[PDB]
């Protein structure tokens, strides 16, 4: 992606989620914000 995160692009920016679904369901895995199903959703850093 153009944002990934600490963890390089093998991940997302989002330490909440892993990296793996969508927030659509129609995909098998993002390394975005752009994708993240649990994108700040609630719990967002654990
Ligand atoms: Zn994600």
Same mark, same amino acid.
Do not use: E, F, Q, W
């Given at each position: 992606?153009?944002?990934?995160?600490? =963890?390089?692009?093998?991940k997302?920016?989002? !330490?909440?989620?892993?990296? *793996? @679904?969508?927030?659509?369901?129609?995909?098998? =895995?993002?390394?975005?914000?752009?994708?993240? !199903?649990?994108?700040?959703? *609630? @719990?967002?850093?654990?």
């Open positions: 992606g153009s944002m990934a995160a600490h =963890s390089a692009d093998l997302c920016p989002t !330490p909440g989620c892993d990296g *793996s @679904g969508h927030i659509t369901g129609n995909y098998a =895995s993002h390394r975005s914000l752009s994708g993240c !199903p649990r994108a700040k959703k *609630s @719990g967002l850093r654990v």
